[PDB]
Symmetry: D3
């Protein structure tokens, strides 16, 4: 597990070129949540499992004081490099999100790009509990998650990446095995291959809300970058608002 | 909605011939639950949304004192007819399960064949609350639910039924539109057709346990007629045990 | 052929409830075309193969002087009924679009909802030629077209419609056989069924442009209700602008 | 079973319009087999399970003396009617092919259009045994066989036929349940529907040969109207040649 | 051909980890067959095409005197290694099963895991003939057989295996081309790949029986580890019982 | 782009072994066109984008005086090598087909195997214009084109090729991204991989005829190696006849 965040860390931004191309639209939505859902001015944000800091840097660019936390130093290495290149001041920390000990010191806490799926029910409750403890009164928690083999390609410099994704689902226990073979091709034909194989957890929007309402005064479920939920939306946002 | 239980009531057992052919194995499992999970002797059972009483009669046949409740008299008419023909004594009552008012008088309450899907979150909570009140200490609540067009046929007397089912899912709001066209063919080619169109709710096993855990001391999740849950099971059983 | 416009005419608006629900967004786009693409003020519009007048009435409601033409009186009957009920003054005429003889008297000519598909190459050229002759200098022609069995349902009063669609394509000759079985169910189960079976022609956006550029000074291809064309758009609009 | 040959007999030729359009191509092949595989002159032919006599009539028209045998009078009625209309002399008899008692009476025995699928292993042996008895030395036995829901349509006069086929396969016992809903639509929308539900047997080319070799000194397997078998052929022909 | 048994021999047990996890369940069934179908005591067993001896070892472990025969030394090397490690006495021989010359020497002869698919009709007869010669009166012959691209993965120590299977079928000649790309990934990304490309033969339960009945006084067809055959079983077992 | 014609040039004929195995039938058709459609005797032929010269050599072998032109020297190297080995005299030239300047000097111009797809509308017009100039009166222009991942394999010497193809279509702009991963496996498992990634253009038969009709007196559309077009043909041939 975590092959994507260690050995493939330097290729993460390449693999997720699309996610980056639309980070601005996503943070526009996040700021609307800060403005309409939060019950306090949002200035300091804790971005959990920040990875290479794609949304982290976008938030920083807009004036937020951001602290990013990630389990893997290989990912943080990339985030710090980009922050330095863009003259953005962000505090990047290594650590497990389940072990944070911040106490009512962030106006908002975020977890971007389906990361709640890495946690089972017990760990998710632990996470939400720690997030609630990290928030200032009226602060908000924001996290997004989604509803044979597929092949695609990207390119980093002279290296071409051919990626093949497939999944194995176990509905009864709400588990999903996400597999991704990444082949890195050099100009002369030499190849290197790495296999991502992570166990993920499947949750419905209602499930997350039920688990979250236990830690936040109010929880909202939104879809498709709008502060509303439509029947056919395919990506969801859970917004937890701390009592003020 | 409810076309299947009103206009098509007399055709229900024909449409669900398969469900009937395996009711004995299902009740064998239910008795195992009464034995291993219930904390009191099970004698009096309340079967909610009993329909034509397929599992209701099988329980009665084994000596249980059963009370069956259903919203539609058309379904109850079939249940009573079969009970009479089989010399089984069962009290069949018409009524909404959400309006029951029984108090500490049933050793076990059941709801067979995916009927929880007819209730949204709010009504499901209301249902579980009333079920808990109806149960006696150590009593158990048992209910089962599942994980373009598909056509199949059955026959009742001289009439042949061609059934076409299809679904429309709204994932965001966890809603499912179950559509079923039932064509009834007579020997001379004359046809009568009826459209079933019910709005159903989509729940995961974890989700139901969460909503139920609030009303029962303990809640268990089982699969495929075994007091355990395997990764690939496709039919689930939720068992609520009243504190004893 | 044309079963949908004769025997099923009174059910057309029911079958296409969705098309109606979004006619306002479509005419908003049409007016943007009038404003930005036309080289003259648009007041009088000829709506060819107007059917039940869905977009025809919407245009009339907005102040345009509209003339609607359709081959089938059964469709016009519906259009006139709705126009009268809404106090909209529209001149509805019966006739073949390939036989129009209007001479430079319309500011714009429209053909809505994939109707160019009913015409093969030769007839399409004839149509475009007649449309060009009907337009005032700087006027515009606007028409939209799209890129096992599928079942769905609608309802008109007490009647329920179960619709099954399937197609048979002949790529070599760019022909498509559009088939639709419409079953009309009455409350007591009695049913009436009609089969739509029309031969349609398949065209690419570039094909239509090449055929249209021969009759209009300038032709534009737009997609998805925007005066631009994106790689993945699935519905197209051809806009022909007459020399001014 | 047999609904297609009784209640739907008068619609058989309509449903199998294509099977008819290429009957000449098929008989050309059959004659090639008489000429190259038969070790005697073929004059008198016994066409088993002749149905509406589609190939039976084509043979007679070419000078062959043919006797057609079928279990259903409803099918023979159509065959005789066509034989009469085309002034072709053919002896059409009603009877079960498993009960024939002919002996050294025919130069060739045929069974067209996948009918062997109606007989299980035991009955197929009985049939082959009877066919061998009916043949004259050097005579030949010829029969063809192939390797949802799917909806299609046809038309007979003013009546339109909408046909929906689907199958249920039992691989272990090599059984196939072929279902076909035939809806007959009148111009005014009135409908008549019949359900075809036959149990068929699945055989591979190898199987048939192994079963036939026991009764014919020589058994050949051909495909796609050629006296050869290619790896990807999808329609097979078994030819049994009686010892001369 | 045979790439899986030569170049990939040391990876066979990894690729077929599941086939191994249920070897005990399979031998339980095999013993049931020895006990109920064999007309003599089974002590000495000949396991044809034994491979890495997965079932061979399970039999020996239960007291049977087993002789394993395989064409490839690379596979036997693995079997002997495991036999040694588990201190099991087994005589592993290299040789072609089509060339065995045993006579009235074994109480039972086995061929596990679909290997009959490697032989065409002619060679399958030769094999069955040899097996019959090798058996003692009342002895039994047992063999199982079943009814893309698909990608899956496994792991042996630090090496990860990504396997991609696809097939090319020739229905007419009942041939199957089974292709499998096995990519072996080292932790540093280095890769080794081998392509499995075997020609296999397609047989139905009926076929095998017809071919076997010629050499065994009694031939039975079973499915899903039970001495019975159900309509939907997908894995079959052929049991040949020598005349006693 | 062009990876297939540069780095993989020496593997082209192996990858397209099938295309080669049927070149004779294709040239048989081409000669029929020279005979029935050309209005002059065909002796000198210009084969544009000749590649490794598969059809080029077949034409030369039949006595035609051929000039082959290709953008990539790597492909021409293979063509010249084969011509030399087969003692065929052909003039192979390097160059862009869009830059040809031949005038009234070829009896026929050809472009085999879907190469028109490499040109957008503008370049295709430019190409047809230059082809017309290169032809002599009554001369003919002939070109053929077709109507997740798919894996297959081939072999060149000791090297095995596993090829995985997939496509990404942009219907609105009629663009297609043809992707092909070619993995070259050596006996010891070592691998070399190359990614083909070309942008292609999608045209219908009618569309090509429209663009061509502008440069040739007559243009014909044929399908499946016959001087006619059938409804279900999947490969098309466009034939331009210069006015004679
Ligand atoms: N327990 C845990 N604690 C901290 N980070 C974790 C974690 N489990 C997973 N992660 C981190 O989850 C991240 C998922 S990738 C998503 C990255 C980033 N938020 C974005 O929007 O692009 C990885 O960087 C991984 O290292
Ligand atoms: N609110 C409600 N109260 C009581 N019955 C209800 C109900 N909503 C739906 N039902 C009943 O739900 C039943 C579903 S059919 C399943 C029937 C039966 N338990 C069996 O196992 O076969 C119908 O008989 C319907 O009338
Ligand atoms: N040759 C022709 N002349 C006039 N109308 C024609 C025609 N061929 C088809 N039609 C008409 O094409 C219409 C297609 S239905 C689309 C209707 C309408 N424009 C809308 O947007 O809803 C039918 O009303 C049919 O009668
Ligand atoms: N036991 C049996 N004896 C005689 N005919 C039989 C039969 N079982 C089925 N059939 C006949 O099988 C026929 C199959 S339909 C094929 C008909 C015809 N040979 C053709 O080529 O078109 C039906 O007409 C049916 O009545
Ligand atoms: N003609 C032949 N003679 C002996 N073994 C053969 C053979 N053709 C194929 N095989 C062997 O067939 C085996 C198939 S693999 C199945 C192995 C083993 N019986 C099990 O149950 O796991 C390979 O080990 C291969 O070497
Ligand atoms: N602009 C251009 N000018 C010349 N050749 C071109 C070209 N664009 C692509 N090609 C050539 O297109 C060829 C396509 S491969 C088809 C090759 C050959 N006609 C056959 O039938 O097998 C390649 O050899 C490539 O180099
Ligand atoms: Mg845990
Ligand atoms: Mg025409």
């Amino acid at each position: 597990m975590y092959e994507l965040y260690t050995l493939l860390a330097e290729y993460y931004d390449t693999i997720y070129r699309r996610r980056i191309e639309r980070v601005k639209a996503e943070i526009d939505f996040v700021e609307e949540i800060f403005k309409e859902d939060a019950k306090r001015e949002v200035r300091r944000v804790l971005d959990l499992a920040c990875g290479t800091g794609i949304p982290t840097l976008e938030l920083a660019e807009r004036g937020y004081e951001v602290v990013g936390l990630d389990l893997h130093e290989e990912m943080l290495r990339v985030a710090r490099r980009k922050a330095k290149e863009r003259n953005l001041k962000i505090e990047f920390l290594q650590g497990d999100v389940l072990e944070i000990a911040f106490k009512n010191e962030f106006d908002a806490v975020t977890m971007f790009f389906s990361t709640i799926m890495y946690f089972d029910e017990e760990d998710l409750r632990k996470l939400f509990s720690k997030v609630a403890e990290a928030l200032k009164p009226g602060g908000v928690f924001i996290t997004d998650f989604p509803c044979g083999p597929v092949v695609w390609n990207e390119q980093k410099g002279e290296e071409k990446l051919v990626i093949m994704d497939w999944r194995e689902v176990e509905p009864a226990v709400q588990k999903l095995r996400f597999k991704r073979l990444v082949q890195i091709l050099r100009p002369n034909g030499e190849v290197k291959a790495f296999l991502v194989d992570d166990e993920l957890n499947i949750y419905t929007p209602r499930e997350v809300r039920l688990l979250a309402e236990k830690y936040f005064e109010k929880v909202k479920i939104y879809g498709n970058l709008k502060r509303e939920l439509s029947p056919n939306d395919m990506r969801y946002w859970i917004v937890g608002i701390a009592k003020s």
